Write a protein that holds these residues in place. Structure first.
Motif, mmCIF file in Angstrom:
data_model
loop_
_atom_site.group_PDB
_atom_site.id
_atom_site.type_symbol
_atom_site.label_atom_id
_atom_site.label_comp_id
_atom_site.label_asym_id
_atom_site.label_seq_id
_atom_site.Cartn_x
_atom_site.Cartn_y
_atom_site.Cartn_z
ATOM 1 N N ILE A 1 4.609 -18.777 -10.220
ATOM 2 C CA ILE A 1 3.381 -18.678 -10.998
ATOM 3 C C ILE A 1 3.662 -17.839 -12.234
ATOM 4 O O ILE A 1 3.970 -16.646 -12.131
ATOM 5 C CB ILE A 1 2.257 -18.068 -10.159
ATOM 6 N N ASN A 2 3.559 -18.453 -13.409
ATOM 7 C CA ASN A 2 3.944 -17.775 -14.638
ATOM 8 C C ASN A 2 2.970 -18.100 -15.760
ATOM 9 O O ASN A 2 2.571 -19.254 -15.941
ATOM 10 C CB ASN A 2 5.371 -18.154 -15.046
ATOM 11 N N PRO B 1 -0.094 -21.834 -3.797
ATOM 12 C CA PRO B 1 1.282 -21.582 -3.371
ATOM 13 C C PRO B 1 1.450 -21.668 -1.864
ATOM 14 O O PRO B 1 0.552 -21.339 -1.086
ATOM 15 C CB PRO B 1 1.548 -20.160 -3.877
ATOM 16 N N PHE B 2 2.638 -22.124 -1.462
ATOM 17 C CA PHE B 2 2.964 -22.337 -0.062
ATOM 18 C C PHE B 2 3.970 -21.344 0.492
ATOM 19 O O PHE B 2 4.096 -21.242 1.713
ATOM 20 C CB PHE B 2 3.513 -23.753 0.149
ATOM 21 N N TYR C 1 5.321 -17.249 -0.449
ATOM 22 C CA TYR C 1 5.111 -16.095 -1.313
ATOM 23 C C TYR C 1 6.359 -15.223 -1.279
ATOM 24 O O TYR C 1 6.651 -14.584 -0.262
ATOM 25 C CB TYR C 1 3.874 -15.316 -0.872
ATOM 26 N N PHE D 1 7.028 -7.947 -8.941
ATOM 27 C CA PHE D 1 6.703 -9.193 -9.638
ATOM 28 C C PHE D 1 6.265 -10.263 -8.641
ATOM 29 O O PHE D 1 6.629 -11.435 -8.748
ATOM 30 C CB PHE D 1 7.898 -9.666 -10.472
ATOM 31 N N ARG D 2 5.474 -9.842 -7.655
ATOM 32 C CA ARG D 2 5.175 -10.690 -6.511
ATOM 33 C C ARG D 2 4.469 -11.968 -6.943
ATOM 34 O O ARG D 2 3.663 -11.969 -7.876
ATOM 35 C CB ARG D 2 4.317 -9.931 -5.504
ATOM 36 N N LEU E 1 -5.693 -29.344 -1.164
ATOM 37 C CA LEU E 1 -6.300 -29.346 0.156
ATOM 38 C C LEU E 1 -5.279 -29.722 1.216
ATOM 39 O O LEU E 1 -5.294 -29.176 2.324
ATOM 40 C CB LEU E 1 -7.484 -30.308 0.170
ATOM 41 N N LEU F 1 -2.970 -26.815 1.869
ATOM 42 C CA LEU F 1 -3.739 -25.779 2.550
ATOM 43 C C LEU F 1 -3.914 -26.109 4.024
ATOM 44 O O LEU F 1 -3.731 -25.248 4.892
ATOM 45 C CB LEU F 1 -5.099 -25.621 1.871
ATOM 46 N N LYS F 2 -4.300 -27.348 4.321
ATOM 47 C CA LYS F 2 -4.497 -27.751 5.706
ATOM 48 C C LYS F 2 -3.201 -27.630 6.491
ATOM 49 O O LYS F 2 -3.179 -27.087 7.605
ATOM 50 C CB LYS F 2 -5.024 -29.184 5.758
ATOM 51 N N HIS G 1 -0.654 -25.710 5.857
ATOM 52 C CA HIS G 1 -0.292 -24.306 5.996
ATOM 53 C C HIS G 1 -1.126 -23.622 7.067
ATOM 54 O O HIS G 1 -0.604 -22.831 7.861
ATOM 55 C CB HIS G 1 -0.458 -23.601 4.654
ATOM 56 N N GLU G 2 -2.428 -23.903 7.096
ATOM 57 C CA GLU G 2 -3.286 -23.292 8.103
ATOM 58 C C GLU G 2 -2.907 -23.754 9.502
ATOM 59 O O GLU G 2 -2.832 -22.942 10.429
ATOM 60 C CB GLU G 2 -4.750 -23.614 7.809
ATOM 61 N N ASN G 3 -2.641 -25.051 9.671
ATOM 62 C CA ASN G 3 -2.488 -25.593 11.016
ATOM 63 C C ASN G 3 -1.244 -25.056 11.715
ATOM 64 O O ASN G 3 -1.284 -24.764 12.916
ATOM 65 C CB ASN G 3 -2.469 -27.115 10.958
ATOM 66 N N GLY G 4 -0.138 -24.910 10.990
ATOM 67 C CA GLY G 4 1.069 -24.402 11.612
ATOM 68 C C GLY G 4 2.289 -25.293 11.483
ATOM 69 O O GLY G 4 3.175 -25.264 12.339
ATOM 70 N N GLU H 1 5.241 -23.185 9.063
ATOM 71 C CA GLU H 1 6.059 -22.252 9.833
ATOM 72 C C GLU H 1 7.239 -22.964 10.480
ATOM 73 O O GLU H 1 8.385 -22.510 10.383
ATOM 74 C CB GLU H 1 5.200 -21.542 10.886
ATOM 75 N N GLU I 1 -9.540 -23.715 5.077
ATOM 76 C CA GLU I 1 -9.727 -25.137 4.829
ATOM 77 C C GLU I 1 -11.162 -25.439 4.424
ATOM 78 O O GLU I 1 -11.423 -25.877 3.299
ATOM 79 C CB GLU I 1 -9.331 -25.942 6.065
ATOM 80 N N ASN J 1 -8.724 -20.341 12.090
ATOM 81 C CA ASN J 1 -7.348 -20.815 12.122
ATOM 82 C C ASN J 1 -6.749 -20.711 13.518
ATOM 83 O O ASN J 1 -5.991 -21.599 13.928
ATOM 84 C CB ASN J 1 -6.503 -20.039 11.117
ATOM 85 N N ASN K 1 -7.969 -23.580 15.323
ATOM 86 C CA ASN K 1 -7.402 -24.812 14.791
ATOM 87 C C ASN K 1 -5.994 -25.053 15.313
ATOM 88 O O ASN K 1 -5.657 -26.175 15.709
ATOM 89 C CB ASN K 1 -7.400 -24.769 13.265
ATOM 90 N N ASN K 2 -5.150 -24.021 15.310
ATOM 91 C CA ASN K 2 -3.784 -24.213 15.784
ATOM 92 C C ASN K 2 -3.770 -24.563 17.264
ATOM 93 O O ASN K 2 -3.073 -25.494 17.683
ATOM 94 C CB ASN K 2 -2.939 -22.972 15.515
ATOM 95 N N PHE L 1 1.340 -15.408 10.037
ATOM 96 C CA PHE L 1 1.183 -16.848 10.183
ATOM 97 C C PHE L 1 0.369 -17.465 9.056
ATOM 98 O O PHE L 1 0.416 -18.686 8.870
ATOM 99 C CB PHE L 1 0.527 -17.171 11.534
ATOM 100 N N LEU M 1 -3.060 -14.233 -14.658
ATOM 101 C CA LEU M 1 -1.612 -14.314 -14.809
ATOM 102 C C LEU M 1 -1.105 -13.309 -15.831
ATOM 103 O O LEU M 1 -0.029 -12.728 -15.652
ATOM 104 C CB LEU M 1 -1.177 -15.728 -15.173
#
Lengths: 41, 134, 365, 377
Positions: free
Chosen positions: C110-111, C123-124, C126, C326-327, C346, C349-350, C352-355, C358, D79, D236, D239-240, D299, D323
């Motif tokens: 992100i810049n 972002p997915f 960090y 500079f995170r 979306l 995001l979905k 990432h939330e669900n798992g 990971e 979500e 969440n 959900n998981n 997580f 930014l």
């Protein structure tokens, strides 16, 4: 005025002294008891 | 300039610490283990009473030389006991080293830019006079 | 990942550690990665992490993709072209103000320097950037005899004990027996060779034995202090560290030249100097520099946190340092305004939330 | 804020009480940057965003009802919350984690981790023994038993009757061997003290579903599941998987601070909640006995944001300003001014060597077996 003045030991030996004195004092009675036991046996 | 003052704790230790600072339970267990080793040596030896008088307990303590060997098994057990004694010696050596390193636990607060005293606490009520330039 | 396909041209021979199929794609990757060569836009085989994410997008969103290697490799910074004053981009997003473009997939931070013209996504992963340094073996091997002590002082005390033995032998009148007894008492042995009749000789021997015990205690305490207190390892910690701040002509640390963070350090008036230092020292790659750091040629190197952490983890040769600054994270790139923005967001995001992120990240990095 | 008149009376007044903090700080800074004015206020009904039969208890719903533009607080991207409204590009990374607290000091005794039982000192010991035996044979110019007694004796300790010298060269070699042995003993004492200098408190579980987080009753200890009603983590975790959900309802006591206060000594040891909040709680914890055993395990690595409308003309400018703020290096200073813990970044027992005693005890049993051979012939 403001400034004229400027500011392996016996601590380990007290308990050691007490224990040594206690051990030494009762030695005579223990030796006498051992001598009596030897004489009776 | 402005600066902070603090009391000091003059004493730190007693130099007369027993085996209980290592651990009193450790001291009792060590005594039990020494008794067990002596009993095992006396059992394997069968000198006799004369041997058991100064066979290993003195040998585990220091060099007296008043032990009566019974077999090469006794010699091997004595070497093992000597190794165990050296291990205990090194363990208590590191114990004393850790105590010596660990001395002076409190850390002097190097100013109020240090948040440590800047963080309010329920233990320190440090302050100045009322109605001062500070 | 860019591993060339099988000789038949078909990517194959790939299975997971737990045992599973591995997904790769052909992609037109010109083998002339060097800056200047007869162009050979050979379709090589490519895979890794972002390829897997794009495949996840394909499985969720119905579309067809033609992944190809960037002809430049530069991440894209404003650059007034030579012999002109017109400001333009270059590299991957220099292709964005160009032909095909229309999509941007890469590890990208992100810049703000590019955010005026383009939009990012959520972002997915960090992670920021930090510093790495080549390593050297520990010197606390205790191989030498009197190195922690003083060998000259050890010789001095040995001469002193020899003179003490000679002086004791002078009072023997046996002398050889007295010397043997002294040498044995030097090491708490008690052989028993020397027992001179004089009581003064025995008293002097006991005193010398105590002195030898004290000397041995001093020697072992000095050696133990030297061993325990040995820790001469100290690198630069943070930007505010002056060794990092001081530009030394002896050792040089740099980053990737003209890549993302170049503007990040060009805009700022605080640092300034190390930007100029890297101007003549920052390299144009992410692998030649990292193999040059271990080459005892580059003192240290600044680059993305995950990249360097992974590179050091794979080969246990170097260690990174420095808490992250500079995170930021990685986000996907687009062009202009495609309606797919909200869908992409979306979806990521979905997932990432669900798992699923990971599992994929643990599998691949 | 609006307060109801006491509690029973639905009426009330908009009392005022000044508020501040990092979100307030960044609010003010962006306000200067963009040159706008605001009449910030406080919400009371509900909290956060979660439809309850398509009913969001204010917060996010306050944005979709066209009832307020901008609403910045403890915001969690999720979500269902990513479609009712539109968010802003984040500037802080934080998600879900565990905050288990152990009862008392946890360290690794490393009783068996002595440099022995390896091939480092074993080769040196073998070479020294071979040299000693060779020198004994040379000086020889019964004997085997006495030589074995000497080898075993002046290696561990001379605290045994093994005295049997022959000549001056024997004394010299004995002196050299004793010097080597005492050097080895000093080196081992120094090494064990150096190990005492270091410490190991690595981890306890290392996983959000490793073994216990499938059926805590089956594992045996029912770790507390003190989540928060209609919060952020709960959606969440459900959900998981519902494996934690079926036990999530077992305990839901109070706010995060009260939860940590109870878990310090009251009933619980393990806590799961948002990352940064627990980071801050543990940093300033009294005595640092409350530290998460996760080494920062997350997580839900995500970001914060702003609760803009569904197209209100604020996205582009807010993104550019945020930014610029991150790149120019400001909320790092803000964070170190606000978010930093107390300890946080700055940093011969009975059981310690207990196990090897048993091993030594086992070794002792081995000697008993040898007696059978002694009884064989």
């Amino acid at each position: 005025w403001v400034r004229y003045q400027e500011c392996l030991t016996f601590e380990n030996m007290a308990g050691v002294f007490m224990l040594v004195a206690g051990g030494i004092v009762a030695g005579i009675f223990l030796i006498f008891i051992e001598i009596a036991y030897k004489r009776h046996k | 300039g402005l600066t902070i003052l603090v009391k000091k704790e003059i004493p730190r230790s007693t130099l007369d610490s027993f085996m209980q600072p290592f651990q009193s339970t450790l001291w009792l267990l060590v005594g039990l283990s020494v008794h067990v080793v002596a009993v095992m040596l006396y059992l394997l030896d069968r000198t006799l009473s004369s041997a058991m008088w100064f066979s290993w307990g003195v040998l585990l303590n220091s060099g007296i030389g008043e032990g009566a060997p019974r077999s090469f098994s006794a010699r091997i057990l004595g070497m093992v006991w000597a190794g165990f004694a050296m291990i205990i010696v090194a363990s208590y050596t590191a114990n004393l080293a850790a105590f010596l390193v660990l001395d002076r636990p409190e850390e002097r607060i190097t100013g109020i830019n240090d948040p440590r005293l800047r963080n309010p606490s329920d233990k320190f009520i440090y302050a100045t006079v009322k109605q001062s330039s500070v | 990942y860019v591993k060339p396909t099988l000789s038949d041209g078909t990517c194959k021979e790939e299975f997971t550690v737990n045992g599973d199929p591995v997904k790769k794609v052909i992609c037109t990757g010109p083998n002339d990665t060097s800056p200047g060569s007869p162009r050979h836009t050979v379709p090589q085989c490519c895979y890794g992490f972002c390829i897997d994410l794009l495949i996840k997008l394909a499985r969720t969103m119905n579309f067809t993709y033609e992944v190809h290697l960037v002809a430049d490799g530069k991440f894209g910074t404003q650059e007034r072209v030579n012999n002109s004053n017109k400001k333009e981009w270059n590299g991957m997003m220099g292709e964005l103000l160009s032909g095909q473009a229309d999509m941007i997939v890469a590890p990208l931070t992100i810049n703000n320097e590019r955010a005026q013209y383009i939009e990012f996504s959520k972002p997915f992963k960090y992670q920021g950037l930090t510093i790495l340094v080549k390593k050297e073996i520990p010197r606390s091997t205790l191989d030498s005899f009197m190195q922690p002590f003083q060998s000259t002082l050890w010789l001095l005390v040995g001469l002193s004990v020899h003179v003490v033995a000679v002086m004791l032998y002078l009072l023997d009148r046996t002398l050889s027996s007295a010397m043997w007894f002294s040498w044995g008492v030097l090491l708490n042995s008690g052989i028993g060779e020397g027992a001179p009749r004089s009581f003064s000789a025995r008293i002097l021997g006991m005193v010398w034995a105590g002195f030898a015990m004290i000397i041995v205690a001093s020697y072992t305490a000095n050696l133990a202090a030297f061993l325990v207190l040995d820790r001469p390892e100290e690198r630069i910690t943070g930007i505010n560290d002056p060794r990092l701040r001081n530009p030394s002509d002896k050792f040089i640390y740099a980053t990737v030249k003209q890549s993302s963070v170049d503007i990040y350090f060009r805009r700022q008036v605080e640092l300034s100097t190390m930007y100029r230092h890297m101007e003549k020292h920052n390299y144009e790659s992410a692998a030649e520099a990292i193999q040059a750091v271990r080459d005892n040629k580059l003192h240290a190197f600044i680059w993305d946190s995950a990249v360097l952490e992974f590179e050091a983890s794979q080969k246990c040769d170097l260690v990174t340092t420095g808490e992250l600054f500079f995170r930021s994270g990685f986000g996907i790139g687009m062009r202009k305004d495609s309606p797919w923005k909200q869908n992409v967001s979306l979806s990521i995001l979905k997932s990432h939330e669900n798992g699923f992120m990971e599992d994929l990240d643990k599998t691949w990095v | 804020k609006f307060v109801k008149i006491n509690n029973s009376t639905n009426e009330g007044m908009n009392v005022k009480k000044c508020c501040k903090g990092f979100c307030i700080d960044i609010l003010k800074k962006l306000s200067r940057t963009v040159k706008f004015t605001y009449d910030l206020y406080l919400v009371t009904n509900g909290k956060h965003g979660k439809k309850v039969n398509n009913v969001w208890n204010g917060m996010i719903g306050e944005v979709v009802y066209q009832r307020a533009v901008m609403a910045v607080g403890s915001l969690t991207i999720n979500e269902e919350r990513s479609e009712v409204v539109d968010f802003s590009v984040p500037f802080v990374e934080t998600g879900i984690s565990v905050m288990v607290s152990r009862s008392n000091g946890t360290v690794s005794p490393s009783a068996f981790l002595e440099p022995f039982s390896a091939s480092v000192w074993v080769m040196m010991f073998v070479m020294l023994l071979i040299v000693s035996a060779i020198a004994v044979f040379v000086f020889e110019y019964f004997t085997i038993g006495k030589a074995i007694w000497l080898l075993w004796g002046l290696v561990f300790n001379n605290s045994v009757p093994v005295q049997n010298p022959k000549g001056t060269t024997s004394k010299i070699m004995v002196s050299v061997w004793a010097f080597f042995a005492v050097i080895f003993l000093a080196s081992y004492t120094a090494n064990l003290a150096a190990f005492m200098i270091q410490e190991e408190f690595v981890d306890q579980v290392t996983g959000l579903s490793d073994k216990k987080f499938q059926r805590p009753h089956d594992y045996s200890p029912p770790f507390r599941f003190g989540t928060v009603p209609n919060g952020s983590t709960e959606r969440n975790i459900r959900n998981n998987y519902p494996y934690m959900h079926q036990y999530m309802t077992k305990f839901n006591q109070k706010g995060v601070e009260d939860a940590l206060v109870s878990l310090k000594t009251g009933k619980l040891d393990a806590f799961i909640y948002d990352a940064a909040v627990l980071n801050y709680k543990a940093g300033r914890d009294e005595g640092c006995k409350l530290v998460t055993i996760g080494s920062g395990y997350i997580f839900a690595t995500t970001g914060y944001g702003i609760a803009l409308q569904k197209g209100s003309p604020w996205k582009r400018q807010i993104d550019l300003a945020l930014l610029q703020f991150v790149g120019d290096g400001e909320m790092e200073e803000l964070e170190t001014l606000w978010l930093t813990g107390i300890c946080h970044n700055e940093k011969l027992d009975i059981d310690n060597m207990a196990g090897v005693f048993y091993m030594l005890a086992a070794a002792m049993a081995l000697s008993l077996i040898t007696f059978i051979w002694e009884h064989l012939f």
